[PDB]
Point group: C6
Chain length 115, copies 6
Amino acid sequence: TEESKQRVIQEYVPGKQVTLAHIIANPNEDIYKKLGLVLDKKDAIGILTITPSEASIIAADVATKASNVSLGFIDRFSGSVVISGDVSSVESALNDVLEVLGNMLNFSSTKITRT
Amino acid sequence: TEESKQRVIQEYVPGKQVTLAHIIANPNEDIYKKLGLVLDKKDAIGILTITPSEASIIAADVATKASNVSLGFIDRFSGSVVISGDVSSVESALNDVLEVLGNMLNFSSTKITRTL
Amino acid sequence: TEESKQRVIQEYVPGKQVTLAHIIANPNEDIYKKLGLVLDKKDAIGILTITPSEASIIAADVATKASNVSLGFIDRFSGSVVISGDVSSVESALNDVLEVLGNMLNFSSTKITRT
Amino acid sequence: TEESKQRVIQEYVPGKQVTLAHIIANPNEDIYKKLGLVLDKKDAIGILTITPSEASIIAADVATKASNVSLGFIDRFSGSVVISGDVSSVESALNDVLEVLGNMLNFSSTKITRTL
Amino acid sequence: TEESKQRVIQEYVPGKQVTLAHIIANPNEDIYKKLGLVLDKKDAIGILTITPSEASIIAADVATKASNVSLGFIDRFSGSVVISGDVSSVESALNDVLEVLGNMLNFSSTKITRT
Amino acid sequence: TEESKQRVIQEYVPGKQVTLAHIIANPNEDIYKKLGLVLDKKDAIGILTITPSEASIIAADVATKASNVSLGFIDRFSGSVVISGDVSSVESALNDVLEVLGNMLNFSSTKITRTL
């Protein structure tokens, strides 16, 4: 019942978290085309989930400086970053992103995952 | 009253969860056409709700690597993934997704459900 | 004061709930035109609020199989489903939606309401 | 610090609430024109905030069945409903909405307020 | 770990709050042009943050009746209201908005701030 | 289970917080071009996350009154502000923003961070 529920005021602010840092070694063509990507058959993708969304800019910059990856897209509204390149380059980029956001800027972090 | 309410600061981050993994065996054409789907009338569809939304990419990739399953759509903004194919292939694909996201990536998961 | 407020991290996920399952027997023409509907004067509408939003697809399919209702619209982003038909057909459709989502899929549910 | 914060999973669902039911008796023309309204300069407006957003349809229907009240707009996405007409008719319509949503559908409700 | 987190269902509704009521005496031209404003060099702006978003309509109406301010914009989706005029007119408008929303309608309120 | 979950009504309002105030000294051109920026290749950028979103207007105004700093963009919907200029000027501007919002307006604040 309406009458039995506690009510609280919640003041919302974004957290600081990298929720996902995932490599897909051999992505299906239908999927990556729907994402707007232009890849070689040999290319892997790396996928990041980041809050606050503006920190996507930091991650994308770190990833592209880290190694030989291309920026697939950055979405500064949602926080999403997708990168592409060889598996080892994508792994190094994701590791650098996690070191900067997680260790340097004290975001809540995660380990790299892979399909 | 305004004066009696507790106030908390909530720092929001996305959870890690597959909330829904549902099969519709013989979907109504008006529904699937409004979703932008082109199906055979023996096709089933599979529907996924995923958080964070980016993990839809993972799920769609895992599902469409499944035999005889086609991507309906992926919405990387909302997390949604809809797939299509014969009912058994669709169930297999959904289960692959739950195994990758739930077991390997430690997402909260759900059982596959179906419209009877 | 800022300093006196507890802070918690909230990881958000959608709930599983049908919040509203409502019949309007004789809807005002201005309203249903603004909603994009094409009705007979005799048609009722049924309105559903559903989380997660993708479950709108399940509800719409169940409703249209249940009885002689037309799909007014489905909004897969918000979860909304509006159906139209005679009152008894709309009632049977809403009941079927509630049985499937509420009883079969264990969503939090509600009773049919009417204006 | 990051390390000291409690972490909870929150499953979100819409509440059932009319947060605002407000009359503006003689609204400024620059405001009502920015809202897309065409009024007589004796018209008042009535403003509703409703959750879940779909219940705006219910409220708009109840309000516009009220004598001498016109629909300004309905926003089924946000829940908003704005109506117009003479001040007493607008108040009557708002009260009808609060009676249906608050009393009959058990929404949390509010009192009608007005810009004095 | 996933397994260690408490889960609660949160039913969301908008709060009633004026979070910000701020005057910028001499706004930078680049900023106010990006906001779509047409000002004199001498004009100040007032900025309001309001929940629920529909109460922006009430605030904008009160502000424009209060004093000699122009409505810069109203955003009924987010709640935002920006007004412009001389500093003293903008201050009187903001004070009237706070008296109506805060004192009359019992919104949680704030004091006027200035740059 | 559905039956075991506590249920609370949460009335949402925006917090008052600068979550991020970050300098990138030599940003990659593919990144800054995707953000719509035109820079010199000695320019740094400064990135702000602000709640409530309207306070981006305050921050952008304070920052661009700083010497040798240009507005990259302001997003009044999300709260974001990106600025550009030589690294020291950008840091000075970010610090001015933290002083106004954090100290004078009592927002929760953060330290300036930088990509090393």
